[PDB]
Amino acid sequence: MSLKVNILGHEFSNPFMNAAGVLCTTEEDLRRMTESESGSLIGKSCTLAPRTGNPEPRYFGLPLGSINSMGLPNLGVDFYLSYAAQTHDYSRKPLFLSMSGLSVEESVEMVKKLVPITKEKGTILELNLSAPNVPGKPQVGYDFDTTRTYLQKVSEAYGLPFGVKMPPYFDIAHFDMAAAVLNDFPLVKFITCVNSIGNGLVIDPANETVVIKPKQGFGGLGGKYVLPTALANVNAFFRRCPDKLVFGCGGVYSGEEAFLHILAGASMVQVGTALHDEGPIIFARLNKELQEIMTNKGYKTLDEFRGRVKTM
Amino acid sequence: MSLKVNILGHEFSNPFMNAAGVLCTTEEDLRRMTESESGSLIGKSCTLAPRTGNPEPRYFGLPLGSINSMGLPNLGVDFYLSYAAQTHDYSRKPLFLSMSGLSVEESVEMVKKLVPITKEKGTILELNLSAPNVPGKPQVGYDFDTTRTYLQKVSEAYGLPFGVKMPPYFDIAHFDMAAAVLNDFPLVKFITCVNSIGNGLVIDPANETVVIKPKQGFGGLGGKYVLPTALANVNAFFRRCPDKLVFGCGGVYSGEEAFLHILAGASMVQVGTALHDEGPIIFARLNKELQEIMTNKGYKTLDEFRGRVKTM
Numbered sequence: 001m002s003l004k005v006n007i008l009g010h011e012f013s014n015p016f017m018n019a020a021g022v023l024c025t026t027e028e029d030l031r032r033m034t035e036s037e038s039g040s041l042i043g044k045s046c047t048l049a050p051r052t053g054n055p056e057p058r059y060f061g062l063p064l065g066s067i068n069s070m071g072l073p074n075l076g077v078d079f080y081l082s083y084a085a086q087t088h089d090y091s092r093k094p095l096f097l098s099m100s101g102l103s104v105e106e107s108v109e110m111v112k113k114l115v116p117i118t119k120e121k122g123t124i125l126e127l128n129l130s131a132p133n134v135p136g137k138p139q140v141g142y143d144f145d146t147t148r149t150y151l152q153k154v155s156e157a158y159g160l161p162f163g164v165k166m167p168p169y170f171d172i173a174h175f176d177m178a179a180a181v182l183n184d185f186p187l188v189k190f191i192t193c194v195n196s197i198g199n200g201l202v203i204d205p206a207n208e209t210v211v212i213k214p215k216q217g218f219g220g221l222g223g224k225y226v227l228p229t230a231l232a233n234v235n236a237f238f239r240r241c242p243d244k245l246v247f248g249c250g251g252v253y254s255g256e257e258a259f260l261h262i263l264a265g266a267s268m269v270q271v272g273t274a275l276h277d278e279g280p281i282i283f284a285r286l287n288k289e290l291q292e293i294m295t296n297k298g299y300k301t302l303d304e305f306r307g308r309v310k311t312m
Numbered sequence: 313m314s315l316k317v318n319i320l321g322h323e324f325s326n327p328f329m330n331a332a333g334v335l336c337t338t339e340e341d342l343r344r345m346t347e348s349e350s351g352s353l354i355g356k357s358c359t360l361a362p363r364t365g366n367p368e369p370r371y372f373g374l375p376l377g378s379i380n381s382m383g384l385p386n387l388g389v390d391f392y393l394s395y396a397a398q399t400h401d402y403s404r405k406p407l408f409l410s411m412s413g414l415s416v417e418e419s420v421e422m423v424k425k426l427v428p429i430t431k432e433k434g435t436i437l438e439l440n441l442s443a444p445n446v447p448g449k450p451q452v453g454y455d456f457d458t459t460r461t462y463l464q465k466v467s468e469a470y471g472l473p474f475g476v477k478m479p480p481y482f483d484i485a486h487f488d489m490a491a492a493v494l495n496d497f498p499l500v501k502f503i504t505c506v507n508s509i510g511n512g513l514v515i516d517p518a519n520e521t522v523v524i525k526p527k528q529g530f531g532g533l534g535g536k537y538v539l540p541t542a543l544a545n546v547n548a549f550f551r552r553c554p555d556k557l558v559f560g561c562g563g564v565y566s567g568e569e570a571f572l573h574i575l576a577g578a579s580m581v582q583v584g585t586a587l588h589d590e591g592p593i594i595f596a597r598l599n600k601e602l603q604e605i606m607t608n609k610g611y612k613t614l615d616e617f618r619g620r621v622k623t624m
């Protein structure tokens with residue numbers, strides 16, 4: 001029995017890691033992720049300068065998942081670059097950093113700074129193209145022209161293998177266009193599907209009031225709301241981008257959901273809402289439950305079923 | 313106490329109607345809708361010529377709602393025109409008809425046929441710009457240039473007040489862009505938010521197979537998955553298109569969800585997945601549950617709280 005994933009030169013113990021934005025903003029956070037049973041971890045989506053984010057309340061836990069408008073609260077690119085350079089124990093597990101400049105200029109400047117650390121330490125870049133909670137800033141991934149610009153300029157400035165955290169798409173034509181852009185950039189070695197289902201509204205019937213303060217209650221949705229969306233996106237990019245990996249993200253609460261992600265095509269499986277609720281101890285549970293399903297089915301490795309979902 | 317609604321020069325006994333596609337394809341379906349306590353009803357999204365739709369299985373009930381790839385099964389526009397002009401009992405309730413031409417040309421031809429019957433009978437048109445289950449046809453509402461063309465040609469052809477069935481949006485810039493196009497068409501008097509969350513994917517862990525045959529498992533999501541997206545879309549168009557009505561659609565199982573939709577701005581509330589599961593008795597239950605909530609809050613009319621959602 002093995003949960004191991006061997007990708008991009010690294011041996012991951014299992015396919016699990018935090019989703020960008022959950023338990024990865026502060027040094028304490030990253031330490032707790034490093035000490036967890038997770039296969040990897042990813043730093044909070046950072047900007048050039050620090051950000052404090054949106055006003056409170058900006059996170060509300062729901063029966064079926066979560067709503068948030070965090071606003072990219074981060075300690076600044078320099079803090080995360082220092083975590084990657086000086087602090088992080090790589091013998092424990094590989095490290096990803098999420099970078100989320102609020103313009104292409106910004107992202108280009110941050111990405112250059114990672115090149116030397118990537119080269120010395122092996123730190124992996126995930127470019128955030130799905131920031132849904134910044135007032136006045138659109139999700140880049142729903143504009144295929146802008147996406148192209150970002151991938152072009154980041155490819156040039158970084159010049160090493162990276163991946164892209166995509167917004168969820170809801171239309172076949174969009175899968176086609178998205179894939180057409182991505183496939184023109186060979187340095188894009190992995191696609192993380194998906195980010196929050198953007199700009200949901202949750203209202204409390206009791207007090208007739210929204211549950212979050214920013215943007216009139218409008219926040220990205222995670223948790224059980226997102227699983228079918230996540231699987232669809234994972235599979236669609238799995239098929240259309242065979243030269244690339246796909247990382248699954250959305251609605252993972254257990255091994256069963258992790259199994260479906262991998263079955264859909266996922267190499268690594270990211271956990272957000274559920275990790276927020278349960279804490280990094282969830283990864284111990286996920287490993288055992290995923291081992292359980294594989295044992296019951298007679299799968300010895302993830303490679304036996306990765307992307308082997310059956311159609312009718 | 314009163315659940316009455318006055319809009320488009322018509323009186324409705326209550327805000328509840330079926331969602332296009334649910335209990336509305338056959339004459340039996342529409343009689344059953346007419347005989348229910350629903351305030352209105354809408355005919356299945358029709359085409360010029362009849363369709364039988366996608367192969368089976370094409371629907372699957374889920375704990376949190378539904379996935380479907382029906383493929384616009386419909387008896388043809390002449391059948392629904394005939395139902396509107398000859399069969400339908402307008403003393404019971406007003407009738408909507410959903411037209412869903414798969415091209416501009418087909419829609420122009422169809423709406424032109426509706427004009428005489430709208431004039432003589434009061435039949436209201438809902439233009440479907442969110443058909444996510446017809447292979448090789450994108451959802452029009454995600455292409456603002458195409459959307460513009462439809463509203464242009466339908467406006468000049470039909471030349472009477474009508475509504476649009478929009479796909480869900482998940483990005484602020486898209487709300488703005490959608491609203492900007494819609495606000496250039498004065499004959500668009502109501503926006504139905506929202507259609508299925510499109511191109512989701514359900515996999516059965518047990519047999520490692522998708523649950524619907526068409527499009528490799530990819531189908532539209534309804535029910536509990538959709539509520540937060542539904543409300544956000546309702547409220548976003550309520551604010552951005554103040555010279556239009558918003559019809560609420562998505563995640564309505566009970567009086568509470570109906571109350572949230574109306575609070576967020578909805579004039580009428582359409583019911584899909586839950587009506588499909590429970591049958592037309594649901595409208596009696598919804599009428600009484602909405603009144604129960606209103607009784608508990610001291611509301612006498614829908615206009616005491618319609619559009620009065622509180623922000624922080």
Ligand SMILES: Cc1cc2c(cc1C)N(C[C@H](O)[C@H](O)[C@H](O)COP(=O)(O)O)c1[nH]c(=O)[nH]c(=O)c1N2
Nearest residue numbers: 019020021045194195196222223250251271272273
């Ligand atoms: C509190 C919080 C914070 C963030 C997020 C989510 C949540 C809940 N998300 C989105 C997240 O990474 C993930 O895509 C979704 O949460 C969906 O996964 P789950 O269904 O929650 O497991 C997010 N994504 C990203 O790329 N960068 C980020 O900084 C954040 N921040």
Ligand SMILES: Cc1cc2c(cc1C)N(C[C@H](O)[C@H](O)[C@H](O)COP(=O)(O)O)c1[nH]c(=O)[nH]c(=O)c1N2
Nearest residue numbers: 331332333357506507508534535562563583584585
């Ligand atoms: C079986 C079935 C059939 C259809 C649909 C759905 C389902 C479940 N839907 C979408 C429907 O009108 C509605 O927008 C969504 O189902 C969301 O509402 P619920 O959460 O299901 O109440 C749909 N919409 C539309 O505009 N025309 C149609 O013909 C259909 N057909």
Ligand SMILES: O=C(O)/C=C/C(=O)O
Nearest residue numbers: 070071072130131133
């Ligand atoms: O920090 C946030 O508000 C979310 C970021 C994301 O969804 O990418």
Ligand SMILES: O=C(O)/C=C/C(=O)O
Nearest residue numbers: 382383384442443445
């Ligand atoms: O008939 C269907 O397949 C779906 C219709 C609706 O989503 O427009």
